[PDB]
Structure 1
Amino acid sequence: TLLDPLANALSHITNSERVGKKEVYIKPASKLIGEVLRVMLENGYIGEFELIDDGRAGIYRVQLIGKINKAGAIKPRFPVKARDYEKWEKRFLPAFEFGILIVSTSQGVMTHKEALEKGIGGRLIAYVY
């Protein structure tokens, strides 16, 4: 059945972007999805995501602008130390600074660049480029 909703959200975004859609809806919402969309908006891959309240959960309305090539979840959520980000970069991204690796830390969800500035590690969840 439904096991992971973040993966579904990201695959839906990927396909809709591939075929040229303007807006997309993400039916089962979650705070992880909210934070990931926040990071994507900060780094300039989407625009103007909004939360809508049906009595079950939240729905997310997202607008697309034409900047995503591929977006996907990372399973399993590998743990990663502050001195091992290069391996996973070379594995998931096509150039030395091209795209973002999204990391969950005990200080919050952020990009691996900020996590390296702060000098901490965590769990890999998603990648975008």
Structure 2
Amino acid sequence: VRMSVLADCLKTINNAEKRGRRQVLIRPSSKVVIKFLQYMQKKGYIGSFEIVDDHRSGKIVVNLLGRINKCAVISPRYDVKLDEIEKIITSILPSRLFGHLILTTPYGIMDHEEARRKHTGGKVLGFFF
């Protein structure tokens, strides 16, 4: 059935972007998903989003700036050491100059660059361009 809420949400977002929507109803909100969205917002790819609280798993609706090329999960959240990062990023995201590879790291979720700055690698959630 659901397994990875986050992945599904990201897929939905991607679809919305492709269509050229504006708004998009990410249907089960999750702390992790919220965090991811926040991160995205910080690096400009997403606009506002109104996490609507039901009395259940919430819905988010999210405001899109027509700016994302793709966003994605990389399931199997592979543990990833700090040295192992570079190769992974080469494999994944389109240019060294841009895109972001989001890790959950014991210092909260943050992008590959952030991780590098810190020192800790961790488990790899997803990415955008």
TM-score where L is the length of structure 2: 0.96
| Long gaps (5+) in structure 2 | none
User: Aligned runs of 1:30-109 on 2, under 5 Å?
Assistant: 30-109=30-109
Q: Name the residue aligned to 2:118.
A: 118
Q: Distance in 2 between matches of 1:78 and 1:72?
A: 15
Residues 54-104 of structure 1: CA distance to partner in whole angstroms, max 9, x if unpaired? 122211110001111111101111111111221111111111122000001
Secondary structure, counterpart of 2:52 in structure 1: strand
More strand by share: 1
TM-score where L is the length of structure 1: 0.96
State the percentage of identical aligned residues. Answer: 40
1:50 alignment partner AA = E
RMSD after superposition: 0.9
Q: Distance in 2 between matches of 1:27 and 1:16?
A: 13
